[PDB]
Design a protein around this ligand. Structure first.
Ligand SMILES: NC(=O)C1=CN([C@@H]2O[C@H](COP(=O)(O)OP(=O)(O)OC[C@H]3O[C@@H](n4cnc5c(N)ncnc54)[C@H](OP(=O)(O)O)[C@@H]3O)[C@@H](O)[C@H]2O)C=CC1
Ligand SMILES: NC(=O)C1=CN([C@@H]2O[C@H](COP(=O)(O)OP(=O)(O)OC[C@H]3O[C@@H](n4cnc5c(N)ncnc54)[C@H](OP(=O)(O)O)[C@@H]3O)[C@@H](O)[C@H]2O)C=CC1
Ligand SMILES: NC(=O)C1=CN([C@@H]2O[C@H](COP(=O)(O)OP(=O)(O)OC[C@H]3O[C@@H](n4cnc5c(N)ncnc54)[C@H](OP(=O)(O)O)[C@@H]3O)[C@@H](O)[C@H]2O)C=CC1
Ligand SMILES: NC(=O)C1=CN([C@@H]2O[C@H](COP(=O)(O)OP(=O)(O)OC[C@H]3O[C@@H](n4cnc5c(N)ncnc54)[C@H](OP(=O)(O)O)[C@@H]3O)[C@@H](O)[C@H]2O)C=CC1
Lengths: 326, 91, 91, 326, 91, 91, 326, 326
């Protein structure tokens, strides 16, 4: 209902849908397609764009930066986010040490041709670096104007609270967001754990892989389609998940969901994405698209939202059978 | 183990979360009951209550259930605190 | 609700402003009477006074008017504090 | 009596009168007139000049900056202030988030052709941003040398105290000033609420619209004069206030005040402005002018000050009938 | 008026310098006698001494000379503190 | 001399390392025994234990070996603390 | 005995004698003489050079900066100090406000052609600026690398302790030195008050006008010599002090001191300066000279030091009759 | 067993062996040899390189910087460390004062042609500078991005704990490493004292002179070989130690160790270095080499490690007779 909303309790306002660059930018699609996709998103109100140092070994960032500079959009109208963790083959080019957070972000900003990102995220937890060090480093790059805010990704609730605790302990800057996977087949963390952190310490939830890499689109019903993400090289892991016993049971449930979609007059992907935004607990949902057809269909999910009645939602939980216990 | 700070009218007490979890249904031991008193700015729970009584309240958890009224705390005042913090005696 | 910090010779007490406002004519409850003791540097009111007595002074507000003399505080000392803080008994 | 005074309890010394740029600079008047007005103010001792990112969509700042650079005045002899809140159409180009305070001020400084402003103000409260975030952002730009001090505008006493409380809590920088409306028909906040904050936490009062947009000048006695602010396009709101039932009652009272003015040998505008400076609670009064005639007349208000006897003041309260209760 | 912070084994007391100056020859009242205990890092005087006794020590200055032994402090322990802080009784 | 901070359930005590070293075999006096309780983040040792009892525990070191049970501390509770901190009486 | 020593308890090592620039640099003497004087000082081990924004309206700083750059001395071998307070005619160009400390020092550094000074001093107390503001500003310029340390000048012990107290209160940077007047006729502050602050909070004492502007040199015995400081324009105040009743009594005592000087085989100026360094309480003594003859004679004072026996010192107190009571 | 490990408890990952530049770089060996040595180290996985402002009066830093820039290695794959203390002949060009830490490091970075070092160390304790000052200065250069972390060298355990205590006191940055001498004839500090600081405050141990300047290589059995470090000019101190009574007793013990080396199928230097890494307490060992033959032999020490059985270790303690008491 409210297209723009605050990211958690922070003052940063984001669109309920965002556009990510994993797999596609600088990889699967062409710079021409990338520009077209970002332009459509922007003109449709999306101000949130996500990327990471590791995507396409830095190329995703280069392409995003080129489009922004080519289009000439006002920096103040964009909310750019990037993640740090995997930035090279050397021993010191990975992790959340002060050294890599600073070198990693600086390098990303250079590739992005930007002075700063709005949110820098730790792409995952670092068992090899003291929390204090990581929090002092995120606070440092923010104070140096390389980032406006920082967040976490793939961190446990306990780890997030610890980051927050250390920040208050040394008067540094707490994280404002956790980027977590969320879709019809991965629900526990976003539905049961994150809400508690929102109300308690104001951390918002920015979710990813709304279609579970495309699985929830229903295109793998009869098998792996040519040119699909599961068909791309380097993604045998995704192909194995889809064809596995678990993968087939998921497809079977999607066939039932497809019936609910047709009943509502929308497509399965739009249902899946609207479903992700049904609860206020989610600040924004990061979309993924390799075609402009996909993107516009996905954005059409916003219209489906008002149809998700309490009966429809309960109906979807009945077929999924995975409603988490709080 | 993760620690928790409880601010009673300015007097700070600190204990391990597992110490409080030892009684899940009491106010301080139930995440949902104590949530209302959390202060995000200082990372502590705040109670605008009687200070002298809290030592006995904390000792209840640390001792595994011993509820001793402090010598300097009147009987009626202590009973009100036991009620607020929802402490039981029955073992 | 907005909180207030009262520093009594180094011992800090914290309570909600509405707790003090419950008695508008007492020294701590009247903005004009307590103004003189405010410390802009630490955002607290400072009193170079007796520490043991203040627990009873704060309890007066938190309890809605109960004025109990602490066991460890002499009768004459407590009466002087009641007078300074301008506390009444008459309900 | 004392032309220059401290702004609140801070060390910043300002002239009792200042010159603002709302409506006029880059809008109603020409750059030539703007330069002339600022030059007259400066040569007459005024060191305070106020503007905002929103005025004339940034043009007010451009014109102010051009004059300063054209005249070559020493930066150290000027006290430049600007306000942040409304800086664009995008969702993220408004508010008091860390992102907009930094981007907003940086953009204003660029338009002003200045390295820093002496005081940056939040143009109004932001219900969408945590106080902590706003205070950390104001402290940040100050520590980055983009501003010397920061203040608030249109904030409640409770909100100002909160800013101060959060600052002391995290050892950041408290605000030093509140820019509030003050004139014969808007008195409560400046006379009853602000003094308490001055004595308690040292916050000073810088007031605006001394003539209530010109209403107190008496020129709307018979109606809306050609080329008057109320006649300008975009100001139908002001025209409606003046012609409304309330507006007429105000004009009726001004006729009585006009008699007091003639008695003292000054004009109504000079009386109105001197009246604003009658109490020490006000650090400075921000003037507005579209003609050089207006400005010099307004500055002449300083001479009227010694005539405002206790009897004259009480006489003015009797006709106004709006003396606030403390 | 300028304030002074006295840290007694971790327990901080704060009072006005003029309060201590009211007895120039006592240890805390004489700049030369208390100098040895000043901590430049925290701007406070530090004494690795008995905590319960100091309330009575500070009250001595605040009350203008009243020396009351706290109920919870043994007679022999209190006399040692009076001696160390060099407090007199004779008015 | 180097000082040490001991945090007992939120109540901080500070003393000189040499004061504790005066009894090398007690828990607080033995570097190896107290190591487990050190908090690197705040540079203090933390004990999730009874607060009222620690004054007597610290006094033991400051007094050179006097072990006095605080009036407000029950006999059984004090004996448990003496045992935990490994304090001896035998001179 | 120890030519170099720490400035107070700080880690900054200064020579027991320093060379100031008041009256001379950019004023009384020529740039050629200035260069010669500074070169002689430097080659003789002096690493301390003092100046101020107000001296010769900024010219003193320009000349000092030119010599340093002309000689090419390593910046790391020099301890440059400047004072801030009087920097212009505008209302905001004087004082210890955040605005002037920053603008003032920045301007001095520009004139000095230096990236930073080793010690920036407040030239005098500022009754118009809150201590907190001043301490936050000194800490700021230090953190910005515009200065290594900061100190006070002409401040009371109470004011210095307050600066120290506020610093510890907000975890900022305490002052490390007080520049105070010290000579045979002005002794109280340096001998009775400053030592207490040294032992208590580590503040060092850097003294000035060792010859009381030349008075202690003995050249005003018969009157005001041509080309003497007292003969210069703008210094009628000094001429009046010397010729006044008090001035004559001082000259009478100098005649007695002259006898002690001849007895020790030194000149009066060397005796006066050695006398200033007799006690460890003084970290360094700032010299003043308009001739190279004066400078080398003054530096010769170091040799006189070992002759100042306890008997000689007591003898000097007997003739002066102004030994302060501690 | 684990080639790369964390430096103490910090997040910085270093190779178990590092390459230092004392004596050799810009001194004993040629830039051509230096480049060759560093290249071999780097290609063999070593990411740690140590130097100091004092080595070859700054030339060691110049040569290291030239190689890095010539080879074009990614800065993020290198862990560069330098030490500060002795940086010139002037009184203020030595020590740990804020002035010299800043000027010293800035000068080293300039010679190294680098924006920052990963770890800046105090080369030794400074009795003339307050700990607070030193800790505030190390924290400052880190916050200015001139260094990622800081450490100590030749400091007592008491001094290190004090640095840590002051840091926690003022919320600054504690040191993360102590660079200490460690070899078969200097064992106490590294084996008994440092482990306690590791477990307690996380300080790691980076050791130097693994071969006691070459003494443990066994080449001084019959005397001082031509072109050996002990034969170089300026190293008569090393020649005297080797030929002294103590020196001879050491050589006698090395003859016994040589037998253990042959038994294990390695050389004495490899045994000595592997011995240094036998305990986890040591994060990294700084090697020294003047030939490529030496370097590759030294790196071969890693293979010897698995042979150091508990029996072999006890055997070595029996011949050394210097096992420290904990
Ligand atoms: N923080 C973290 O750890 C992570 C964050 N993320 C973020 O979120 C995004 C990841 O979501 P992603 O994982 O890309 O995707 P989704 O789960 O949303 O799946 C999108 C993919 O599904 C297919 N698809 C999309 N729309 C349609 C449609 N309407 N009909 C049919 N097929 C469709 C496409 O596959 P095809 O290309 O085969 O056509 C496309 O690439 C990234 O861009 C990244 O920013 C991702 C991973 C980890
Ligand atoms: N912080 C905040 O929220 C706000 C701050 N302000 C600040 O204060 C200023 C606003 O005051 P403003 O509101 O401009 O004005 P005033 O209330 O002082 O009215 C000035 C207007 O009155 C007329 N006028 C001025 N002098 C005379 C005279 N002597 N005789 C007849 N008419 C006269 C002119 O109208 P005409 O052009 O019709 O001739 C002129 O523009 C701005 O410049 C701004 O800096 C303003 C609004 C909000
Ligand atoms: N922080 C503060 O508030 C102040 C600091 N200071 C500092 O200290 C210095 C001030 O000392 P200053 O006041 O200059 O001087 P001194 O008291 O040392 O007097 C030096 C003056 O005496 C004369 N003189 C010097 N040596 C001899 C000699 N051997 N024989 C005869 N006459 C001699 C010269 O007068 P002539 O030129 O007549 O030959 C010279 O300018 C400044 O340079 C400044 O850096 C000064 C004032 C205030
Ligand atoms: N922080 C501090 O205070 C200090 C740190 N250090 C650090 O550690 C390093 C010092 O170790 P260093 O002291 O150089 O040396 P080592 O103890 O490791 O001895 C290396 C020397 O031994 C000889 N050598 C090396 N390998 C062999 C071999 N395989 N066979 C025969 N001889 C061999 C060479 O002598 P030759 O040249 O004679 O061939 C070489 O220079 C420096 O590079 C520095 O970075 C050093 C001193 C102080």
């Amino acid at each position: 209902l409210q297209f723009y909303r605050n990211l958690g309790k922070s003052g940063l306002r984001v669109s309920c849908l965002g556009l990510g660059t994993w797999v596609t930018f600088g990889g699967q699609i062409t710079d021409e397609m990338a520009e077209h996709l970002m332009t459509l998103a922007y003109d449709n109100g999306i101000n949130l764009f996500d990327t990471a140092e590791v995507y396409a070994a830095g190329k995703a960032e280069v392409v995003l930066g080129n489009i922004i500079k080519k289009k000439g959009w006002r920096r103040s109208s964009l909310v750019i986010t990037t993640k740090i963790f995997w930035g090279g083959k050397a021993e010191t080019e990975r992790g959340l040490s002060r050294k890599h957070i600073i070198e990693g972000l600086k390098a990303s900003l250079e590739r992005l041709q930007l002075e700063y990102v709005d949110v820098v995220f730790a792409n995952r937890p670092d068992p090899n670096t003291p929390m204090e060090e990581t929090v002092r480093a995120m606070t440092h790059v923010i104070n140096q104007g390389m980032a406006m805010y920082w967040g976490t990704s793939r961190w446990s609730s306990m780890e997030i609270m610890e980051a927050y605790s250390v920040a208050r302990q040394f008067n540094l800057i707490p994280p404002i967001c956790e980027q977590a996977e969320y879709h019809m087949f991965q629900r526990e963390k976003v539905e049961v754990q994150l809400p508690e952190l929102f109300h308690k310490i104001g951390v918002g939830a920015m979710t990813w892989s709304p279609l579970a890499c495309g699985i929830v689109s229903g295109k793998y019903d009869s098998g792996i389609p040519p040119y699909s993400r599961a068909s791309l090289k380097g993604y045998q892991w995704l192909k194995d998940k889809i064809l596995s016993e678990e993968g087939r049971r998921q497809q079977a449930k999607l066939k039932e969901l497809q019936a609910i979609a047709e009943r509502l007059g929308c497509t399965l992907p739009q249902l899946a994405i609207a479903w992700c935004l049904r609860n206020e607990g989610v600040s924004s949902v990061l979309l993924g698209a390799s075609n402009a057809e996909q993107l516009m269909e996905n954005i059409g999910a916003i219209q489906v939202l008002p149809k998700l009645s309490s009966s429809i939602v309960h109906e979807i939980d009945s077929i999924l059978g995975n409603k988490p216990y709080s | 183990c993760e620690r928790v700070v409880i601010n009673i009218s300015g007097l700070r007490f600190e204990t391990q979360l597992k110490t409080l979890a030892q009684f899940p249904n009491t106010l301080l031991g139930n995440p949902k009951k104590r949530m209302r008193y959390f202060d995000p700015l200082r990372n502590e729970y705040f109670f605008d209550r009687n200070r002298p009584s809290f030592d006995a309240i904390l000792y209840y958890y640390q001792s595994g259930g011993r509820l001793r009224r402090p010598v300097n705390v009147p009987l009626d005042m202590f009973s009100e605190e036991i009620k607020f913090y929802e402490l039981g005696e029955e073992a």
